[PDB]
């Protein structure tokens, strides 16, 4: 897990030897793994590249971070408001700093991860201090231009 | 982080003995080729340096132990218990004020989510 | 549902005064005798009672419980912020509402 780098944000043009060919300049990528879905039978955008040394994986994570690969925000990492279609290049501290401009955050946010890879699932949950920050996130942040990924902010629970 | 904290404590001790706002022992040190990034207010350590300077100024008070001796806080446990009870009452009043502010914010959020947003009038 | 049905609507005439600042509108409202502050919100012109053509702008509307909502159209994309807790104020002593 230390020598392997988890890549997120892969489109349909990216393939299993294509990621190994793109990561060959960063370091000696020994193997590439792409988990296939059960309903569609294709990649879900997240994969893994197992290299030989941990320094090559660190250089690939520091070089290929927030890159625009196949029209997709590909990024390598070390393997009541709901935000969907978020970029995997952002972290919890980056999401807390991005959410601090609209309103005040009550605590540190959390992002959902896949049970197989564990880098990024695609959705996240963040809680605001009051309902005014949630309304400002649903008015402004729900549709704002993020890092090559259109996010969507919505209410997790609402009572009619 | 011990050397930076010691430098901040030395700057707070040297700046508290000044007779003016700008005529201090640290303003002339900035022009004497001494790098001090904690003097600018843009850094996060400046908020702690200001609190250290405030504590150094409060350590120079006449009831702080320079020319007088405290008798109520040092020789009366009942006065300390009354001060602790007053601090607990102030904390309870602050918690009640925060709960009232949260209730007012919830009432404003309930009133804003129930008003009609289709009756537009441009005058 | 209970607060929306019990809200009285007589629709009085509001008094708004705009001023181009550089670094802000002042709405004169009567005494409401309540703790509910008037709230401002920016919406689109796609939803209307009659749906007129060529509606592709935004409108910032301020609304209160005893008074009617006053709306101002903004042709620009983003020149200010329509947040309530950021750049708005409501003095209950003089009953003056300001938003910048």
Curated annotation (Swiss-Prot), chain A:
Superkingdom of this protein's organism: Eukaryota
Span of domain RRM: 3-79, 80-158
Phosphotyrosine, modified sites: 46
Subcellular location(s) per record: Nucleus
Self-association and partners: Component of the 17S U2 SnRNP complex, a ribonucleoprotein complex that contains small nuclear RNA (snRNA) U2 and a number of specific proteins. Part of the SF3B subcomplex of the 17S U2 SnRNP complex. SF3B associates with the splicing subcomplex SF3A and a 12S RNA unit to form the U2 small nuclear ribonucleoproteins complex (U2 snRNP). SF3B4 has been found in complex spliceosome 'B' and 'C' as well. Component of the minor (U12-type spliceosome) spliceosome. Found in a complex with PRMT9, SF3B2 and SF3B4.
Family: Belongs to the SF3B4 family.
Disease: Acrofacial dysostosis 1, Nager type: A form of acrofacial dysostosis, a group of disorders which are characterized by malformation of the craniofacial skeleton and the limbs. The major facial features of AFD1 include downslanted palpebral fissures, midface retrusion, and micrognathia, the latter of which often requires the placement of a tracheostomy in early childhood. Limb defects typically involve the anterior (radial) elements of the upper limbs and manifest as small or absent thumbs, triphalangeal thumbs, radial hyoplasia or aplasia, and radioulnar synostosis.
UniProt function note: Component of the 17S U2 SnRNP complex of the spliceosome, a large ribonucleoprotein complex that removes introns from transcribed pre-mRNAs. The 17S U2 SnRNP complex (1) directly participates in early spliceosome assembly and (2) mediates recognition of the intron branch site during pre-mRNA splicing by promoting the selection of the pre-mRNA branch-site adenosine, the nucleophile for the first step of splicing.
Protein name: Splicing factor 3B subunit 4
Species assigned in the record: Homo sapiens
Entire protein: shown range: 11 to 181 of 424
Swiss-Prot record, chain B:
Marked site (Critical for binding to SF3A3) residue numbers: 10
Extent of the SURP motif repeats: 7-49
Effect of residue 10 to K: Abolishes binding to SF3A3
Transmembrane domains' residue ranges: none
Compartmental location: Nucleus; Nucleus speckle
Tissues of expression: Ubiquitously expressed.
Subunit composition and interactions: Component of the 17S U2 SnRNP complex, a ribonucleoprotein complex that contains small nuclear RNA (snRNA) U2 and a number of specific proteins. Part of the SF3A subcomplex of the 17S U2 SnRNP complex which is composed of three subunits; SF3A3/SAP61, SF3A2/SAP62 and SF3A1/SAP114. SF3A associates with the splicing factor SF3B and a 12S RNA unit to form the mature 17S U2 small nuclear ribonucleoprotein complex (17S U2 snRNP). SF3A1 functions as a scaffold that interacts directly with both SF3A2 and SF3A3. Identified in the spliceosome 'E' complex, a precursor of the spliceosome 'A' complex.
Domain writeup: SURP motif 2 mediates direct binding to SF3A3.
Protein's job: Component of the 17S U2 SnRNP complex of the spliceosome, a large ribonucleoprotein complex that removes introns from transcribed pre-mRNAs. The 17S U2 SnRNP complex (1) directly participates in early spliceosome assembly and (2) mediates recognition of the intron branch site during pre-mRNA splicing by promoting the selection of the pre-mRNA branch-site adenosine, the nucleophile for the first step of splicing.
Protein's recorded name: Splicing factor 3A subunit 1
Gene (UniProt): SF3A1
Residue numbers of the full-length protein present here: 160 to 282 of 793
Swiss-Prot record, chain C:
Positions of modified residues (Phosphoserine): 44
Domain of life: Eukaryota
Localization, UniProt: Nucleus
General function of this protein: Component of the 17S U2 SnRNP complex of the spliceosome, a large ribonucleoprotein complex that removes introns from transcribed pre-mRNAs. The 17S U2 SnRNP complex (1) directly participates in early spliceosome assembly and (2) mediates recognition of the intron branch site during pre-mRNA splicing by promoting the selection of the pre-mRNA branch-site adenosine, the nucleophile for the first step of splicing.
Subunit structure and binding partners: Component of the 17S U2 SnRNP complex, a ribonucleoprotein complex that contains small nuclear RNA (snRNA) U2 and a number of specific proteins. Part of the SF3A subcomplex of the 17S U2 SnRNP complex which is composed of three subunits; SF3A3/SAP61, SF3A2/SAP62 and SF3A1/SAP114. SF3A associates with the splicing factor SF3B and a 12S RNA unit to form the mature 17S U2 small nuclear ribonucleoprotein complex (17S U2 snRNP). Identified in the spliceosome 'E' complex, a precursor of the spliceosome 'A' complex. Identified in the spliceosome 'A' and 'B' complexes.
Family: Belongs to the SF3A2 family.
Name of the featured protein: Splicing factor 3A subunit 2
Organism: Homo sapiens (Human)
Lineage, opening ranks: Eukaryota, Metazoa, Chordata, Craniata, Vertebrata
Gene name per UniProt: SF3A2
Included range, full protein: 104 to 209 of 464
